[PDB]
Amino acid sequence: ADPEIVEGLPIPLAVAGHHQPAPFYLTADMFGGLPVQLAGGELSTLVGKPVAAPHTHPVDELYLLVSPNKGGARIEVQLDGRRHELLSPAVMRIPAGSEHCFLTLEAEVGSYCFGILLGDRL
Amino acid sequence: ADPEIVEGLPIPLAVAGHHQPAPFYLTADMFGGLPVQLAGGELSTLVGKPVAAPHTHPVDELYLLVSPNKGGARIEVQLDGRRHELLSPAVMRIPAGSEHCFLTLEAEVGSYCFGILLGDRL
């Protein structure tokens, strides 16, 4: 087993507000310790099916939205109780402590949203 | 214009070893300053077409490989002059200073590889 690689992905972690574990691709324990965590997933099966209720983390975060066609995915991010619209590709800042969640309004195969956590606590 | 969002993506930055600019989705200047940078892209048009010669960065890095079907993308990462194989989903550590690059061997629509730079210098 090659210590430079992790193939045991995603790592499903319990996360506040979620109805099933969130899929993690980077965790804080990896490779002797990372300064970020990263969760997310492909959106084609999540149209109209939010992964979570509004929830918080004690670290700043970023949402990253990508899709193979320009504008191929659209999400709504609730932040501080108000909706923001993202059209792929896009990034959005989510301040530490802020109540947030996203909803997929449209996606194609290969649309991805990731939550990038700028620290090691959830 | 909503300061919490960046829609002007990707941000094509000149990067050593590349033949065209690398597509950045997170840059160090964003949102008043980030501690990471992130570049990458969809792999279906990159099968057999490496983006770069071996090159280095002065910060630790991670490669993240995802695809809509489990095992739907396979890449080879050269690290320290030796090839490592990644089958999606996977992550690989790339130590600061280490000569590295990747080659897409197989991908489907929606396969993505990202380089996640654990610092603010290239």
DSSP string, B26-43: E-TTGGG--S-EEEEEE-
* Residue appearing with tokens 């997170």: B26
CB count in 10 Å sphere of residue B33? 8
CB within 8 Å of A45: residues ≥ 6 apart: none
Q: Cα A106 vs. chain centroid, distance in angstroms?
A: 16
Among A10, A64, A116, whose Cβ lies nearest the Cβ of B89?
Answer: A10
CB within 8 Å of B60: residues ≥ 6 apart: B93, B94, B95, B96, B118, B119
* Sequence letter at residue B11: I
Instruction: Report the C-alpha gap between A38 and A57 in whole angstroms.
Output: 13
Annotated binding residue A29: no
C-alpha dist (Å) from residue B98 to A8, B39, B59, B78, B120? 24, 17, 9, 10, 17
Among A2, A79, A90, whose Cβ lies nearest the Cβ of B6?
Answer: A90
Q: Is B105 exposed, middle or buried (0-12, 13-18, 19+ CB in 10 A)?
A: middle
CB within 8 Å of A119: residues ≥ 6 apart: A35, A36, A37, A58, A59, A60
Instruction: Report the C-alpha gap between B40 and B38 in whole angstroms.
Output: 7
| Helix, strand or coil, per DSSP, at residue B94 | strand
Mutation to test the B interface, candidates A43, A66, A84, most B Cβ within 10 Å: A66
User: Which segments of B3-85 does DSSP mark as H helices, in order?
Assistant: none
CA nearest neighbour of A3 among A41, A32, A28, A23: A32
**A52 neighbors A94 (Cβ within 8 angstroms):** no
* Residue appearing with tokens 């087993």: A1
Peptide bond into B10 cis (omega under 30): yes
Which experiment gave this structure? X-ray
Q: Which residues of B touch A110 (CB under 8 A)?
A: 42, 68, 108-112
Strands lying side by side in the sheet with B82-87: B82-87, B74-79, B100-106
CA nearest neighbour of A58 among A25, A5, A98: A98
C-alpha dist (Å) from residue B24 to A36, A64, A91, B12? 18, 11, 11, 6
Please check whether residue A9 touches B, CB under 8 A. yes
**B83 neighbors B107 (Cβ within 8 angstroms):** no
**B7 neighbors B25 (Cβ within 8 angstroms):** no
Please check whether residue B44 touches A, CB under 8 A. yes
**B116 neighbors B95 (Cβ within 8 angstroms):** no
* Residue appearing with tokens 């969809």: B42
Resolution (angstroms) stands at 1.4
**Residue A102 parent element (H or E):** strand A100-106
Among B4, B10, B44, whose Cβ lies nearest the Cβ of A79?
Answer: B4
* Sequence letter at residue A2: D
CB within 8 Å of B112: residues ≥ 6 apart: A66, A110, A112, B40, B41, B42, B43, B64, B65, B66, B67, B73
Q: Cα B35 vs. chain centroid, distance in angstroms?
A: 16
Instruction: Report the C-alpha gap between A53 and A16 in whole angstroms.
Output: 8
